[PDB]
Amino acid sequence: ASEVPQVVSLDPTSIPIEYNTPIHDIKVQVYDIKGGCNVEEGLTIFLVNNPGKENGPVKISSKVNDKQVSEFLKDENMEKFNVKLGTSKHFYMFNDNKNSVAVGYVGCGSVADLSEADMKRVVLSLVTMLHDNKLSKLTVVFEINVDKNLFRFFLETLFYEYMTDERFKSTDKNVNMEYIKHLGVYINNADTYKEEVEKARVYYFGTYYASQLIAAPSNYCNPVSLSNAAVELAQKLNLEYKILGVKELEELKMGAYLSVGKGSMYPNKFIHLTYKSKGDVKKKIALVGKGITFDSGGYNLKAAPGSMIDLMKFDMSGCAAVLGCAYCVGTLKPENVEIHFLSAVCENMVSKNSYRPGDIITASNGKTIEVGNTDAEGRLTLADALVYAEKLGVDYIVDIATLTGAMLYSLGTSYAGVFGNNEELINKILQSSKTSNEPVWWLPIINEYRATLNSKYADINQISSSVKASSIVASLFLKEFVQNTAWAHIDIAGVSWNFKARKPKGFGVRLLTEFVLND
Amino acid sequence: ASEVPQVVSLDPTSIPIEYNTPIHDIKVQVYDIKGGCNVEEGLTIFLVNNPGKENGPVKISSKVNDKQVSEFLKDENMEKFNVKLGTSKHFYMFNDNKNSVAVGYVGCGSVADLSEADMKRVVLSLVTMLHDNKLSKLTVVFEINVDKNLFRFFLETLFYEYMTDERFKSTDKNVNMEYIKHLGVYINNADTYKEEVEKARVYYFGTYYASQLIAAPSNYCNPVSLSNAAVELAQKLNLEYKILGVKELEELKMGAYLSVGKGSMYPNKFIHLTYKSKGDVKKKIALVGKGITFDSGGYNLKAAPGSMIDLMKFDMSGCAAVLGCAYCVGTLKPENVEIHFLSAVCENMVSKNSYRPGDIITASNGKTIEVGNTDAEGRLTLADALVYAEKLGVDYIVDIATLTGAMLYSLGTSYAGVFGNNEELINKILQSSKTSNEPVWWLPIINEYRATLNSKYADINQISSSVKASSIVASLFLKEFVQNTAWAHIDIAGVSWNFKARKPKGFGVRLLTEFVLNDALHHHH
Amino acid sequence: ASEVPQVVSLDPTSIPIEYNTPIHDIKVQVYDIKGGCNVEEGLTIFLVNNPGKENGPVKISSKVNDKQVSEFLKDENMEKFNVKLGTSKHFYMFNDNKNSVAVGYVGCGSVADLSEADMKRVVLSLVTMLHDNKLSKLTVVFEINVDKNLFRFFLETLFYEYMTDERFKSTDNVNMEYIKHLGVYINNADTYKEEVEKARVYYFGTYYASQLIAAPSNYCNPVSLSNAAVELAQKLNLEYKILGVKELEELKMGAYLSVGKGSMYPNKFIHLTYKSKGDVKKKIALVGKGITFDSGGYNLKAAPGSMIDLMKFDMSGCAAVLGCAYCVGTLKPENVEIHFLSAVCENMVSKNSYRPGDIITASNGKTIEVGNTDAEGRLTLADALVYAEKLGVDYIVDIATLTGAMLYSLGTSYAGVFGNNEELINKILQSSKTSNEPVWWLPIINEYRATLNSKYADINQISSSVKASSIVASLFLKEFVQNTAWAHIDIAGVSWNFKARKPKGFGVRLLTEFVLNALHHH
Ligand SMILES: O=C(CNc1ccccc1)N[C@@H](C(=O)NO)c1ccc(-c2cc(F)c(F)c(F)c2)cc1
Ligand SMILES: O=C(CNc1ccccc1)N[C@@H](C(=O)NO)c1ccc(-c2cc(F)c(F)c(F)c2)cc1
Ligand SMILES: O=C(CNc1ccccc1)N[C@@H](C(=O)NO)c1ccc(-c2cc(F)c(F)c(F)c2)cc1
Ligand code: NA
Ligand code: NA
Ligand SMILES: [Zn+2]
Ligand SMILES: [Zn+2]
Ligand SMILES: [Zn+2]
């Protein structure tokens, strides 16, 4: 652990992190629907659809073990309500023991198989029922068909959206915010879904941990404090760790990564965590996250309208996903694998000491690079991280990065893009996207654009002379720093931030963990 | 008081300040017009109107105690000239003692009651007659009706516009500029106006002193040299003074103000001057001035077309007005008041050390603030200054600040905007606007916009997510740092700089002094 | 009624207008709260605050005539909910007769005195519940203190926000049914009863203005809008006159006609008149800016943020004047004569358009140098104001989406009022208070007048140097009013609800309150 430099004594010296969240105190119980539902304290919510009948009526099919509640939920009373996706109603009544109970439903539409986006809308409606209501228990009755992965995603998303991050509130903490202590779930074939519960709780926290790092502003979350947080995480999980400082980075000749950080008051810190299975290692994987804790753009300052310099604390979202994956992997302990979690962390600032547009810098593999724009800093840091990763001798290198704003014009805010030099690895990532329910789309590395990276003076240009397809150009540049290892690159610039809710998504934690686990 | 850091040895280490100005050497005398005007030397100017007759003829009403000059001034010789506001003519003639004299007039229009804008137009025409003419004496004959405040305004405005600031001239000083040594004034009921003369001279210098600080560039006028200047002023006036440095500001937890200054080579300096009357103190007042000695914008750099980064030495105009008020109050010594003159002085710069867009910082009242734009820095420094002010236990807090460029689109360059949480205090400011002749207009604090300052992570956002009425949003933000004290906020971003003349106005010195003096005097007088 | 020109046969030739709305079928009953609440039918919502406990718990005080609902409303249950402004919960349950009812609340915060903005938040929360409701009755129980004007504002806002404009949809909602009954429990119910039918009138005036504003510029053009005004006048038995191009040329309205030169739609000048049956003691002209589409002209709205896609709303001032005509023609005030005026046209790009730099002559003989074809509203108003002053009225009030600078001075909530007469300004401010449509007085600063001095024409249309554009526009308009008390209401910032993507109908209620309460009555 290194000391965080301060300008004034009021500058923070660590990222506040909540490990023991209220979600972790919730006791989860799963019951089979065949035994009927007991309707007692708290709120009991039925998830109901009506296939093929758009905005069709609500009908409750499950057996309910209360005559009063069964009478309330008969078809004649329920048919006045409809299943329109995201719609909900609350019910009040006295049960057979003369206790008042609260019941309701969330509409799940008319399409038998819900997409991750549909299921998220269902969860958001459920969370509105949890907020502003002091409940000790929620019970959820599944009258829809979900596979095991989608059941886990429901739980992960519920936990994540319910959790409210108050680390930076002082005088404006929500004085009414209370969390349930119990969650009941009724589902058909419950025994087959029970193994998903604790996996969902792990995936939730890896994702929420990533969100905590992302949302932490750049005065709290800087290269020293972020690498310190990684050390503490490794200590908690018994992972091996190494933080490389400037002197070691100079010895490794990491000139592209070091140049980006020249202008910052925070020394560069390179994170290397390692998980190794106890048994024979059958696969070795390097996960590389882009870790720019604030991106001002440098001398190519983000001053253009719409460049959103105020959100650029999120430019370490890739590092956060890799560290959240380390939480999940260190918790779940997969066998037969060795995983390296890597991030070349730095901050891109304006200073007398900053690198300049036009500088020619030398990466750790000897390639000279002409810098065309100091705001294309992520690919420079990743170049040196990829050289480092390939020296580890791994089977797969996967990097994840908020690399190019063009991602918003190609895939938008819902799907990440994956690029790579190896179809088998790309297909493994796409399969992990399916089982994590974090959507990714394969995009091409178009070799015809490579000539636009030819530099008159250096071995290569950082940016293209003509091509505006920057996500593809960036991938061509990165490809030059992986010589003979299967490699894939996930550009999460469009999917990292939830603009409607003004908070991170923690995108990539579950994708990467499913990738490690399914291998 | 503190050493000014330098990058090279040629960097200045103090603000040059002229205290003993040529205006202070002018001997002023007021005579009653009923005794007639003696026309002996120099230039004699008649202020003449023609009520109800647009561009009507010049006719001189005064008795003139010279037969030759009286003959020149006959209606018949004056009829080719008219009273159009701001027009002037010069006359040359020999008086009864066979000495050559210069006589003329400035037209005051056809509307009996002159506004501040009209009176300034009259003064500017008079000043053109003083420039490029080596005169030892000016005499002004009021053939128009002015009340006591407008007469004082005439002199203050004359003194201020006549004064030429040459502190930064080296090889291009004006070799021909000579100041008059005598000013004569003829007016009806002269005895009632005589007390306005030395009041005008005090108000002139408070305003010119503020102008000197504003016009001083940011290499001369930085947080250290500006606070050093305030100490020197306090010492000359026998005011109590305290300059708070970074270590004391850290102990007071002023994280909003300190964050703005992080990127500067100049340490933050918080100015606290105090005037206290001898005897019973009936009212305690805090005047808070925005003191950004240069506003680059920070990482939200002022790079957009029209952002005027080259004029941002003027972002301490609020502090300048407060220090000019301290000069006037410390000179005039009102009774029954205790006045605190406050400014959280710093510089908003780009550096490896600067605060960043998105940072969450903690104000001295414990409120966490999400920074949405480093160029909304003034309201961050004022938030901590207002917390400091309220801890003094005052009856009124009035802040004055070049806060929002939106003022140019609401009131423009003539009228300042006042916002506040207390109708009585707002009305006192409006009354002070009337008697100082510095115009201000009351604008609302619209509470419906407060929710757009709600932050997802911090207690409050610095800037709004959707509202473009930035002067109102900034006021809503400042209101969060005043808990239970009458408070008003004067946004002078639009009125501080005279774009036509390329110089400061020193706006607010006379407004704030009139505010203090009118409060020091019981309403029964 | 003039024929609407078409480019293709699919171009619409009228504005669709709904007069009979579901709101008009709601039977409203007001009951005194001191007698307890009948809750056996429909949806019952309690308006609840908690002074002295910020976001504190909900507590319901009223006695209710149903044992099941009384148990739901026990303190132990409602303390699970909080009063944060706009927060709501509602539950369905069976009453003592085993009939389905729904009961809930809207939180009204912790400050006893609600502003109009707070009351809008409460109403929006209520309307969200209504747009998912099929019970035939809503009952609202005021356990908060509201004055008579604010209670009327509650009803108007409830009606306006509840109503959904479906004129341009090709289908029709499976999720709600409009209520047939509205019950209100409030203290002093007898004094609030007279506000109900006034609110219903004010609602439709605002909704009518909203329909004209929201109607797109292919539906709402100078011909179809003046045709709609004629139809309204006929239904209300107002006198009406539409001036066409030949009459406008005879009246020498060169400023207004220049703006419309580039349009395929002929200019149409709307003049409706309400005259009281008794002696006329006061004459008022209401002048609304009626640009049915503002492209900017050759000064095209191409800059970032210029919002050319929303510029069907540049006739919001005309819409407010016509909605006021509906309210005045319906309430029939005494002793007044009201002229409702709008110089209607469209600002387009064409070989026939006026150009930046053109010098045009207004109907009072003043020549104007055009500095920007997108400052077209003040040109149309100049001629409208000359026409208005020739009517010999006591007051001229104009209302207009005139200057974008309003968004930077007062924003989206308060309109600005300017004028040449302090008494008339104070009357407008009082109408703002009793209509609950907020306005703030801004100055006409005479020092800026010299920037309208033109080198060649009598006056410049715009300033080259002064950025206080709302004040400069007021100085320009003031030159077309010679000797009559005049006020100018700039609604450019408040007229469109950006969050809800719909008009506000701002100004109908303000102007009607001015006309109803202008003349003191003893
Ligand atoms: O890609 C570029 C330059 N071309 C470009 C920029 C913006 C839009 C289209 C093209 N610059 C990147 C950078 O600075 N990398 O270091 C960058 C810039 C922006 C975002 C981002 C993230 C978000 F969440 C957004 F919503 C968003 F609009 C943009 C990510 C990376
Ligand atoms: O208000 C903003 C937001 N931008 C903005 C918007 C609309 C118009 C102008 C600026 N930024 C302020 C700031 O940077 N505060 O620190 C600021 C900026 C400019 C002036 C100023 C002073 C003058 F004397 C002027 F003549 C003038 F045009 C502007 C004052 C404060
Ligand atoms: O005033 C100007 C000069 N430009 C300008 C100056 C300062 C700031 C912004 C624009 N242009 C006007 C125009 O072109 N009139 O014809 C105009 C422009 C926009 C809106 C408007 C209406 C709305 F309903 C809004 F919601 C809104 F945000 C803006 C009204 C008038
Ligand atoms: Na962060
Ligand atoms: Na329309
Ligand atoms: Zn970046
Ligand atoms: Zn960048
Ligand atoms: Zn600024």
Ligand SMILES: [Zn+2]
């Ligand atoms: Zn500033």
Ligand SMILES: [Zn+2]
């Ligand atoms: Zn326009």
Ligand SMILES: [Zn+2]
């Ligand atoms: Zn317009």
